[PDB]
Amino acid sequence: MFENITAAPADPILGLADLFRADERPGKINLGIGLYYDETGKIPVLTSVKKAEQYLLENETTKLYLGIDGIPEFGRCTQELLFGKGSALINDKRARTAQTPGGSGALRVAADFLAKNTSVKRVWVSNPSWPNHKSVFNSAGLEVREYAYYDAENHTLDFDALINSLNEAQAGDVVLFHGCCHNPTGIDPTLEQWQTLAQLSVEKGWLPLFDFAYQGFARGLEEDAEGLRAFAAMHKELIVASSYSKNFGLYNERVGACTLVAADSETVDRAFSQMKAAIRDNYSSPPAHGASVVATILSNDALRAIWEQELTDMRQRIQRMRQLFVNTLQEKGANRDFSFIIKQNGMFSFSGLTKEQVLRLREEFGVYAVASGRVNVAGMTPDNMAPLCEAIVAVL
Amino acid sequence: MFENITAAPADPILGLADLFRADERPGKINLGIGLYYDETGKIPVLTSVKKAEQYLLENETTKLYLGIDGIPEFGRCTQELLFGKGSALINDKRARTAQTPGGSGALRVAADFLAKNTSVKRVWVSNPSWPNHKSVFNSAGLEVREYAYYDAENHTLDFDALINSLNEAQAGDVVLFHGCCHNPTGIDPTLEQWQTLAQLSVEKGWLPLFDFAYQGFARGLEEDAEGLRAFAAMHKELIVASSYSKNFGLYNERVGACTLVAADSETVDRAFSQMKAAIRDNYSSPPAHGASVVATILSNDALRAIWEQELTDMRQRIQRMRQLFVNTLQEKGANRDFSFIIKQNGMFSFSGLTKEQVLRLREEFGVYAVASGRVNVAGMTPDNMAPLCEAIVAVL
């Protein structure tokens, strides 16, 4: 039965990580995968996370299955983060949240729900986008189309091209938005641009799908949700796939949520029963540990305070590295203006390095970035910055 | 987009649990869902599990993502449990294991792999079977057909009907077997019956899919794997979806494995790359906590000793309740022979109660079982046995 199966196409980005670990050069620098490093180049467990895990160790008395949609307090805390406490969406009970194995898990659940229960045939993703979006939607049986996004000359959101290319989207297509910290560009719509999109989206009959993996990494928890909330103020229906991998440093515990919004309580409860059915035929119910950690933190004043500060620390370290990167580039003799890097949001920006320049960086300098020239700024440190920038200057 | 979605059909078994928690009667007895209760009617965390969780708390320094297939030591330990240490399958590197979110997760991954990469159009399941089998396979786009299994008059495996009905299976169909502790009958093939099946399966060109959720609950870890190992000695190719939910009391942590076996190393590595692709487009990588607990236990002599004894304790408590159940039934005036219960394996047997008798038990006596009359023996205790049996006698 398996004799004739052809190998899956190598994933160049996971193939990168694989190449990194095999590299015996001591000064090797990892700017590939989207992970937060501290100033010592390590990927720590958050202190608030350790404290919550101690609490669970000392207090959990069972591992009895969660409901299909996971821990209720997790759902409640997630909707407050998303929509704001006292939001009319919450008061009107228009939203239902399933705890999922990561944001990736949430994307798959949404895709499966849409494919099996609606007329949706296609999803619009930005060009460029995180490559996994196409993969997940295609695997669910959905076509993926691309909309213009990035003005690479001005390092800006090409809002005209975006709007113009989205005009080819039909009523009933899904349009995917990144809530903040667009991967890979670091370029997000302004509040005004988000409000214009929310208006266009309603007129045109698009179903908004928000991918919200970096809440707290652009400006702050509430500020980062402004775009979503502008849509939520305008739309009867919306889906949000959110993740706590990055803002809790909980990557491997697979902690995310798929949130469904409909016009009213009866509708959302009805539609959510089909989302629960999709989950049931997948992994049945989600993993408790990472999500209990999140719920324990978000629902305790003292832990939440510590965690919010840890998140602030992470965001500010990245902002410092953005500035340090452009400064060291200038000092190291780089020809180019890299100032656009300072304005961009989250872990990533496009460096503007070619695929060949990145290959050179890896082979000659042990500096690992992805083929698009996207770099993980959260992988830069005061200790690695000088060798990093000397390497970039050498390849320009 | 969601206005016209119809509600998912209520799941009577999850609807049962929901009904149970709303029941304010004090002496209520839960014999529904497959969970291990101790003699005080609680569903405890295993001591070996708590010790492993303490160790992880004190020693983990990162939550960096696992590989798509999870923790390598988890895979190694899983294959040894499945095939036996020193197995030729392991020595020849014919097997690859992906850590998955539970046995349910493993079933979905297998189904997705099969549907997307092979000519498989149908899966044979026993009649009766765990209802989720049909659901999972159908959701992946696979037809499900049923084979005869149960001789309800003699409370036995109807081996003739099974073999006769499986004759309608074509070369290239999947046949699903429960490794031990058949859900719901508690009736497993003997070693001889398993060997005959392994032979038939080869001749007929079936792809065996083992669902192995209760290793250790029939006779013991090695004894329970005898059927699988008889197949593995005969087949070039096989898939195993296994779970640690029940034998580690780790239900909500979603800890399982999908193991792929092929004729040789090159083949299995090739086919497994497509299984990894299916996982990538689902939940991306599996949750670390529950699987690290399992790997930490299985790979430490002291913890493994404690855990194996805890598992032995669970198996023996169930065997005691089987005997106590039939004894108390006789003492309480039951007309019927219930002796077949003593011989059956795992958490469940068919009580022979009608759907109406079970409805009566619930409404009049607060005793919760499923419509098929299947009861969770692991939900019986010395304290609840008398009221339970008085209730059954009343409804006969």
Side-chain angles (χ1 to χ4, degrees):
Chain A
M1 213 101 32
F2 312 148
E3 314 94 302
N4 205 246
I5 296 173
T6 39
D11 178 344
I13 283 192
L14 299 185
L16 243 212
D18 203 45
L19 218 36
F20 184 86
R21 293 207 94 249
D23 197 347
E24 265 128 58
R25 272 106 48 106
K28 58 181 189 176
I29 299 169
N30 194 353
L31 306 188
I33 180 158
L35 294 149
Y36 178 82
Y37 299 78
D38 66 24
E39 61 297 332
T40 68
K42 289 178 264 176
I43 310 165
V45 183
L46 274 47
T47 297
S48 60
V49 166
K50 286 292 193 182
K51 291 173 73 64
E53 287 184 320
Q54 183 168 317
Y55 176 82
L56 298 181
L57 204 217
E58 286 166 353
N59 293 278
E60 274 179 10
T61 60
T62 187
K63 305 286 197 177
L64 169 273
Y65 294 105
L66 307 176
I68 296 174
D69 51 350
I71 303 167
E73 188 63 29
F74 177 87
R76 231 134 46 215
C77 288
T78 288
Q79 295 184 190
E80 296 189 345
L81 234 25
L82 261 30
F83 300 125
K85 88 156 195 320
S87 157
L89 267 68
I90 298 166
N91 293 347
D92 289 350
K93 297 182 157 188
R94 287 218 270 134
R96 296 291 302 268
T97 289
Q99 174 200 327
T100 54
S104 302
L107 258 0
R108 185 48 181 263
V109 167
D112 284 345
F113 161 78
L114 260 14
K116 291 176 191 149
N117 297 281
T118 72
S119 66
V120 168
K121 37 180 179 167
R122 73 196 59 78
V123 182
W124 297 75
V125 310
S126 57
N127 171 216
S129 198
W130 192 52
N132 306 54
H133 283 138
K134 186 191 200 273
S135 222
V136 173
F137 304 131
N138 280 170
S139 79
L142 266 15
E143 103 162 285
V144 165
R145 301 232 24 213
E146 291 180 331
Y147 62 89
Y149 192 76
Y150 182 52
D151 182 329
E153 180 176 331
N154 296 305
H155 307 87
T156 207
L157 208 175
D158 200 335
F159 198 62
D160 283 356
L162 151 35
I163 275 191
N164 167 71
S165 89
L166 270 189
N167 256 40
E168 61 204 326
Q170 282 168 113
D173 287 354
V174 170
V175 185
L176 190 130
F177 299 100
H178 294 45
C180 68
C181 303
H182 185 268
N183 182 354
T185 64
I187 305 294
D188 300 326
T190 56
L191 217 213
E192 278 65 34
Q193 283 174 335
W194 276 127
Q195 284 166 163
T196 293
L197 286 169
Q199 192 165 329
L200 225 221
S201 185
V202 166
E203 301 180 10
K204 250 85 162 92
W206 311 329
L207 206 228
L209 209 190
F210 279 74
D211 177 334
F212 204 15
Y214 303 95
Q215 188 174 189
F217 280 93
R219 282 177 307 163
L221 290 169
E222 299 296 286
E223 295 95 326
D224 290 7
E226 275 171 12
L228 205 208
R229 272 124 85 150
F231 271 68
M234 293 270 80
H235 281 77
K236 291 179 182 167
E237 299 167 333
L238 234 47
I239 301 170
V240 185
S242 59
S243 173
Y244 294 108
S245 288
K246 289 88 164 197
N247 55 19
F248 280 80
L250 280 173
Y251 320 94
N252 70 12
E253 300 299 2
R254 313 310 298 122
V255 194
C258 185
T259 294
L260 225 199
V261 179
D264 58 30
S265 216
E266 185 278 334
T267 302
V268 77
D269 290 356
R270 238 197 308 103
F272 193 63
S273 69
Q274 294 285 12
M275 178 165 288
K276 281 157 92 192
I279 291 164
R280 174 211 59 224
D281 296 342
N282 192 345
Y283 51 84
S284 179
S285 61
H289 187 254
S292 325
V293 164
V294 168
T296 290
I297 289 167
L298 298 177
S299 68
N300 180 98
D301 287 338
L303 287 179
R304 193 189 173 121
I306 289 158
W307 164 76
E308 282 195 36
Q309 185 56 50
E310 287 187 292
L311 181 52
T312 293
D313 289 344
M314 290 188 275
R315 180 183 67 252
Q316 292 176 153
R317 201 187 80 77
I318 293 163
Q319 304 176 147
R320 283 196 303 276
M321 293 304 94
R322 292 186 173 278
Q323 183 69 237
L324 186 54
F325 190 53
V326 345
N327 279 356
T328 306
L329 255 15
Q330 193 266 164
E331 287 165 354
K332 234 84 233 200
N335 20 98
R336 297 170 32 166
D337 179 5
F338 282 93
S339 71
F340 57 87
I341 287 180
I342 294 159
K343 287 184 90 116
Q344 301 182 157
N345 288 144
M347 293 182 178
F348 306 117
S349 23
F350 270 159
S351 59
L353 267 23
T354 60
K355 55 152 150 44
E356 295 78 10
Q357 282 170 325
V358 314
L359 197 282
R360 211 179 144 195
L361 282 171
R362 204 229 301 148
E363 297 207 297
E364 185 175 347
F365 305 95
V367 170
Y368 287 66
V370 300
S372 64
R374 177 256 260 168
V375 292
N376 179 201
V377 177
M380 308 177 179
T381 64
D383 283 334
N384 75 21
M385 192 63 80
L388 164 64
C389 289
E390 285 161 8
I392 293 167
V393 167
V395 309
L396 295 176
Chain B
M1 213 101 32
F2 312 148
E3 314 94 302
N4 205 246
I5 296 173
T6 39
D11 178 344
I13 283 192
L14 299 185
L16 243 212
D18 203 45
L19 218 36
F20 184 86
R21 293 207 94 249
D23 197 347
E24 265 128 58
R25 272 106 48 106
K28 58 181 189 176
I29 299 169
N30 194 353
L31 306 188
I33 180 158
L35 294 149
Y36 178 82
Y37 299 78
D38 66 24
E39 61 297 332
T40 68
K42 289 178 264 176
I43 310 165
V45 183
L46 274 47
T47 297
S48 60
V49 166
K50 286 292 193 182
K51 291 173 73 64
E53 287 184 320
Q54 183 168 317
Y55 176 82
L56 298 181
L57 204 217
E58 286 166 353
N59 293 278
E60 274 179 10
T61 60
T62 187
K63 305 286 197 177
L64 169 273
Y65 294 105
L66 307 176
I68 296 174
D69 51 350
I71 303 167
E73 188 63 29
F74 177 87
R76 231 134 46 215
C77 288
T78 288
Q79 295 184 190
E80 296 189 345
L81 234 25
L82 261 30
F83 300 125
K85 88 156 195 320
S87 157
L89 267 68
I90 298 166
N91 293 347
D92 289 350
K93 297 182 157 188
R94 287 218 270 134
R96 296 291 302 268
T97 289
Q99 174 200 327
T100 54
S104 302
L107 258 0
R108 185 48 181 263
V109 167
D112 284 345
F113 161 78
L114 260 14
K116 291 176 191 149
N117 297 281
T118 72
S119 66
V120 168
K121 37 180 179 167
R122 73 196 59 78
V123 182
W124 297 75
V125 310
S126 57
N127 171 216
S129 198
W130 192 52
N132 306 54
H133 283 138
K134 186 191 200 273
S135 222
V136 173
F137 304 131
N138 280 170
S139 79
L142 266 15
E143 103 162 285
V144 165
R145 301 232 24 213
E146 291 180 331
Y147 62 89
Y149 192 76
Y150 182 52
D151 182 329
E153 180 176 331
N154 296 305
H155 307 87
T156 207
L157 208 175
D158 200 335
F159 198 62
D160 283 356
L162 151 35
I163 275 191
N164 167 71
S165 89
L166 270 189
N167 256 40
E168 61 204 326
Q170 282 168 113
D173 287 354
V174 170
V175 185
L176 190 130
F177 299 100
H178 294 45
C180 68
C181 303
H182 185 268
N183 182 354
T185 64
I187 305 294
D188 300 326
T190 56
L191 217 213
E192 278 65 34
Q193 283 174 335
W194 276 127
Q195 284 166 163
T196 293
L197 286 169
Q199 192 165 329
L200 225 221
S201 185
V202 166
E203 301 180 10
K204 250 85 162 92
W206 311 329
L207 206 228
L209 209 190
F210 279 74
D211 177 334
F212 204 15
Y214 303 95
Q215 188 174 189
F217 280 93
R219 282 177 307 163
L221 290 169
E222 299 296 286
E223 295 95 326
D224 290 7
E226 275 171 12
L228 205 208
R229 272 124 85 150
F231 271 68
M234 293 270 80
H235 281 77
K236 291 179 182 167
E237 299 167 333
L238 234 47
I239 301 170
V240 185
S242 59
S243 173
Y244 294 108
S245 288
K246 289 88 164 197
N247 55 19
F248 280 80
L250 280 173
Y251 320 94
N252 70 12
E253 300 299 2
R254 313 310 298 122
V255 194
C258 185
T259 294
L260 225 199
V261 179
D264 58 30
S265 216
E266 185 278 334
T267 302
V268 77
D269 290 356
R270 238 197 308 103
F272 193 63
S273 69
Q274 294 285 12
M275 178 165 288
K276 281 157 92 192
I279 291 164
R280 174 211 59 224
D281 296 342
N282 192 345
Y283 51 84
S284 179
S285 61
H289 187 254
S292 325
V293 164
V294 168
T296 290
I297 289 167
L298 298 177
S299 68
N300 180 98
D301 287 338
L303 287 179
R304 193 189 173 121
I306 289 158
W307 164 76
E308 282 195 36
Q309 185 56 50
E310 287 187 292
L311 181 52
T312 293
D313 289 344
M314 290 188 275
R315 180 183 67 252
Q316 292 176 153
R317 201 187 80 77
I318 293 163
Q319 304 176 147
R320 283 196 303 276
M321 293 304 94
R322 292 186 173 278
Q323 183 69 237
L324 186 54
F325 190 53
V326 345
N327 279 356
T328 306
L329 255 15
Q330 193 266 164
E331 287 165 354
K332 234 84 233 200
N335 20 98
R336 297 170 32 166
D337 179 5
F338 282 93
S339 71
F340 57 87
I341 287 180
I342 294 159
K343 287 184 90 116
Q344 301 182 157
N345 288 144
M347 293 182 178
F348 306 117
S349 23
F350 270 159
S351 59
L353 267 23
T354 60
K355 55 152 150 44
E356 295 78 10
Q357 282 170 325
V358 314
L359 197 282
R360 211 179 144 195
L361 282 171
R362 204 229 301 148
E363 297 207 297
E364 185 175 347
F365 305 95
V367 170
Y368 287 66
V370 300
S372 64
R374 177 256 260 168
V375 292
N376 179 201
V377 177
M380 308 177 179
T381 64
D383 283 334
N384 75 21
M385 192 63 80
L388 164 64
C389 289
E390 285 161 8
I392 293 167
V393 167
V395 309
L396 295 176

